[PDB]
Structure 1
């Protein structure tokens, strides 16, 4: 199995006003997006040591009682309003992964999308402050820290495609973004439950099967344990780990609006028996956000693809992904 070319891109110019330096970053983003589809963002300014530490404290200290109280509807019939946000339980002996998902902290009962009961909008659920002091504060802060990095990355993608730098970012707003953070624990288990290991067609043992991401872009921090593979025409290639950088890829909404010029890379998660974290931030726009599709290959950029509302895209995509790769 070969190793994927995943460049490390210094994204710091995207926070500045040196326009030529931003263009040189955008060229590297373009090149990566047309190759394997992945790159590492380095010099990003986020304290990822604190993120990993606080996440570890939470996963290791939460109890079965608390997990039921926080569980999404798939695990607790009482929580009919929690489809996205909450705890995703492991099943001892059957399912190893567990995770906690939270959404825009601005989604409160006062928010009009919550008042209207618009699909995909939910109010976050949190553990008791006294049992997990500082966790909610850290998690909400982190949402806005990674929001800020993601805004900057969206400027790079816009420039890469020959658009003005706010082309995507103007639709990525703190008041309505459907973006999510997922705090995923992959445990060390001995013996490891065979039910939690899938066998790929090529024989590889997997924790999560091939998929395209449901996102505009995905902004991922992982601990330093190699696990990801990307599909190329010549087969799957290993993505090397880097626990100081963020791993970035496009989701299927980017592929739609660029007429597959920037594809959403197909990728999968190898089984590795090691305690590790996987902390994605899924960059989603607003429920009514629409970007007119275009084709960067054409002189006039004309595309015959229908504009797709981001909310309808996200509702369909989240359900499709559960149906194909299983309830996480």
Structure 2
């Protein structure tokens, strides 16, 4: 039998305002959730999530095999050596059900000095033909900034929750250099569903994606209304209930590092479910040179022995490690 994780719904709307005590009350809820299961739902967040899942649906359903090759990351197309992160992630019928499209900071253009320098993890987004997918790129880029604004506010809540000034994290989260990504993931309904696309967990649960910690500072996730996620606790995995109006929030391993594991990166996995559904994560990454000094909120002096980590190197290592452990997505 499988229990259900406590995932509180936190009204985050005070984090956009100037009622400082109300923000502390939000911060307390984020603190409590971060110390319990590690997940909470952000509600009253101001993003039109209906248009998000609509625009995403028409894209996945109308893109053709030719277009998928044209946009494919180098794991699927050797011609595209510059596309490590951004581009299309093809399904492999009979073998791999999931497919996705990942894009990065729209300000990453040929003019950007990180592109000029060819710094790892920086890429120029690739987009389908505007006439074949009208309004898609416009919707996608605006969504990047809509969720960017939400994440900035959420980061002020985390900062206050940890006893810091509200810009402790957000100061490093900037439109000019953020390494944050959006991934538009389609999980298809398949009949018959290929067993090769299903992994079996140690406890016997059938999975689409194995246990992992997120490579992020925090992750800001919209999913359609199909229950699939599980979070690991000391008593085993617990089901995370769906909510296709809220944003599911969790800390990534960079937060665990800088808080001396005070806010853990929750380990979670994706159950196999034979249902058409969407998963649209926004991975909140900082800039390539961003460094946050670790601290320990458990200690009176707040001192940590842990080494400061540059975020770019953390991200480069983390992305490659997740691929090796859980397979090329």
- Which bracket does the TM-score occupy, shorter chain normalised? over 0.9
CA drift at 1:55: 0.1
Listed one character per residue, the Cα deviations across residues 264-287 of structure 1 (whole Å, up to 9, x for unaligned) are: 000000000000000000000000
The count of corresponding residues between Structure 1 and Structure 2 is 328
Across the aligned residues of Structure 1 and Structure 2, the Cα RMSD in angstroms comes to 0.2
Listed one character per residue, the Cα deviations across residues 6-50 of structure 1 (whole Å, up to 9, x for unaligned) are: 000000000000000000000000000000000000000000000
CA drift at 1:205: 0.2
User: Given the alignment of the two structures, is residue 65 of structure 1 paired with residue 66 of structure 2, yes or no?
Assistant: yes
CA drift at 1:93: 0.5
CA drift at 1:176: 0.1
Between the aligned partners of 2:107 and 2:300, the Cα distance in structure 1 is: 41
CA drift at 1:319: 0.2
CA drift at 1:131: 0.1
Between the aligned partners of 1:297 and 1:248, the Cα distance in structure 2 is: 23
TM-score, L = length of structure 2:
1.00
Q: What SS is found at the alignment partner of 1:144? A: helix
Between the aligned partners of 1:129 and 1:326, the Cα distance in structure 2 is: 32
CA drift at 1:314: 0.1
Listed one character per residue, the Cα deviations across residues 219-238 of structure 1 (whole Å, up to 9, x for unaligned) are: 00000000000000000000
Between the aligned partners of 1:203 and 1:162, the Cα distance in structure 2 is: 41
Between the aligned partners of 1:36 and 1:178, the Cα distance in structure 2 is: 27
Between the aligned partners of 2:108 and 2:193, the Cα distance in structure 1 is: 38
Between the aligned partners of 1:234 and 1:194, the Cα distance in structure 2 is: 28
CA drift at 1:4: 0.3
CA drift at 1:290: 0.1
Structure 1 residues without counterparts, runs of 5 or longer: none
CA drift at 1:128: 0.0
CA drift at 1:172: 0.1
Structure 2 residues without counterparts, runs of 5 or longer: none
Q: What SS is found at the alignment partner of 1:218? A: strand
Listed one character per residue, the Cα deviations across residues 166-185 of structure 1 (whole Å, up to 9, x for unaligned) are: 00000000000000000000
Match of residue 319 from structure 1? 320
CA drift at 1:97: 0.0
Match of residue 107 from structure 1? 108
TM-score, L = length of structure 1:
1.00
